[PDB]
Amino acid sequence: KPKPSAIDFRVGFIQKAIKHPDADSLYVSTIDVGDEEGPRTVCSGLVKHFPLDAMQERYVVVVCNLKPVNMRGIKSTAMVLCGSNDDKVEFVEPPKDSKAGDKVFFEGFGDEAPMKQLNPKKKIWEHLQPHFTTNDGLEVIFKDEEEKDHPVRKLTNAKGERFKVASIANAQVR
């Protein structure tokens, strides 16, 4: 069974973001995710949603173990987690005093190491993503319809804190 523990979620810090020189819809962010190898290069379709100043020196949640993607000629090695509806896109916001590299995980799905790289053929991310959302309190949650005893798991960290969006309840988080 696909489970959120397979996914490597972390807090990232966007050191710098620039326009993708060959793709108007994309920013290229340099994001510290606590790798011993330096920051990662991440391409995000956020240009129509946020200006450059909103990108700089921002703490984000990043998915870190998907296979890298060629995004208009630039290798993107992580993905910034956002909650969206039909009209609007919002960053998932780490809690106060988060640090780059902080492990982020859903309740009950934290005590196992993520896969080094997700097997694309298993589509773990794709199977799980319809169930990542936000509650009315704007906290990111995972809905586990099978587990009758624990149908909702909150996104959290080692301090048992919460990860929120600015305004969208029932958001599409991915």
From Swiss-Prot:
The main place the protein resides is: cytoplasm
**Boundaries of the shown chain within the full protein:** 203 to 376 of 376
| Keywords linked to the UniProt accession | Cytoplasm, RNA-binding, tRNA-binding
The tRNA-binding domain, residue ranges: 3-105
Annotated source species:
Saccharomyces cerevisiae (strain ATCC 204508 / S288c) (Baker's yeast)
Q: Which GO terms describe its biological process?
A: glutamyl-tRNA aminoacylation; methionyl-tRNA aminoacylation; tRNA aminoacylation for protein translation
Q: Where in the cell is it found?
A: Cytoplasm
Q: Name one GO cellular component term.
A: methionyl glutamyl tRNA synthetase complex
Protein name per the record? tRNA-aminoacylation cofactor ARC1
Name the domain of life this protein comes from: Eukaryota
Question: What would be the name of the gene that encodes this protein?
Answer: ARC1
